[PDB]
């Protein structure tokens, strides 16, 4: 189609009731996916202490084209997607959970959105999990990236090769994240299909979600 659409405020919650929760996690689904889908990762990820928020994308897609299309071709849908993630973060903080106890988890299109949001808005977060994603745009626009991660643990993975996410863009993303003071774990899985492997799940559970 095109990028001339809005993500309306569709937010699905699960996990610990937010008023009781010590921590929260913002979970971002992939292209053609759903909030209910992505939440089911709580069955294998150590999220049992988190209030879970998963916004649902309009058209089940955050933005219409490859994350590496000229960024204007993904606008205004992308800005709308970033706005919605920001609304979710704002809601969590208003429920009394500070950003340093807020975690992010995304797969594929959702991992790209996760990285793009957190890097435009870098501060001390609980942790950031980007399963097969990179920062967004044909050209990286460094001028959009502001803040300091204050050693936020970040896990970023991809497969090699992967026709959706070149290894080069994951490397570039790592370089930018490290420059902004994230504590970055990058893992590239040669020959892995476009998926979340069991190894990634265990690794995230023993590190970011320790």
Tell the smallest beta-carbon distance from residue 204 to Na ion (Å): 10
Helices (H) and strands (E) in the chain, counts: 5, 7
Tell the smallest beta-carbon distance from residue 34 to Na ion (Å): 26
Dihedral angle, C-alpha 119, 120, 123, 125, nearest 10 °: -60
Distances from the Cα of 50 to the Cαs of 25, 89, 164, in angstroms?
6, 14, 30
For residue 58, the SS3 value is helix
**Which one, 20 or 210, has the nearer CB to Na ion?**
210
**Which one, 11 or 183, has the nearer CB to Na ion?**
183
**Which one, 48 or 179, has the nearer CB to Na ion?**
48
**Which one, 84 or 209, has the nearer CB to Na ion?**
209
Tell the smallest beta-carbon distance from residue 127 to Na ion (Å): 6
Contact set for Na ion, span 103-162 (CB under 5 A): none
Number of residues engaging Na ion in binding (CB under 5 A): 2
Tell the smallest beta-carbon distance from residue 49 to Na ion (Å): 9
Burial of 155 (0-12, 13-18, 19+ CB in 10 A): buried
Question: Residues 180-209 vs Na ion: string with x where CB under 5 A?
Answer: -----------------------------x
Report the C-alpha gap between 82 and 114 in whole angstroms: 9
Residue 100 zone, left/alpha/beta (φ > 0; ψ -120 to 50; rest)? alpha
**Which one, 37 or 49, has the nearer CB to Na ion?**
49
**Which residues would be at the binding site for Na ion (CB under 5 A)?**
209-210
């Amino acid at each position: 189609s095109n990028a001339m659409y809005t993500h309306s405020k569709q937010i699905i919650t699960s996990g610990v009731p937010v008023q009781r929760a010590k921590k929260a996690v913002v979970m971002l689904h992939g292209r053609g996916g759903t909030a209910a889908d992505i939440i089911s990762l709580q069955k294998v990820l150590k999220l049992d202490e988190m209030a879970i928020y998963a916004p649902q994308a309009t058209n089940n897609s955050w933005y219409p084209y490859s994350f590496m299309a000229p960024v204007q071709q993904n606008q205004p849908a992308l800005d709308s997607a970033l706005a919605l993630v920001g609304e979710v973060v704002a809601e969590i903080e208003a429920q009394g959970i500070p950003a340093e106890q807020i975690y992010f988890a995304g797969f594929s299109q959702g991992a790209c959105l996760t990285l793009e949001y957190t890097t435009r808005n870098a501060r001390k977060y609980g942790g950031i999990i980007a399963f097969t994603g990179g920062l967004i745009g044909q050209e990286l626009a460094i001028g959009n990236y502001k803040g300091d991660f204050k050693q936020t643990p970040v896990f970023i993975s991809t497969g090699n090769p992967d026709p959706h996410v070149p290894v080069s863009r994951v490397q570039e993303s790592v370089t930018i994240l490290e420059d902004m003071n994230a504590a970055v774990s990058q893992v590239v899985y040669p020959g892995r299909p476009h998926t979340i492997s069991g190894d990634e799940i265990q690794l995230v559970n023993n590190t970011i979600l320790k």
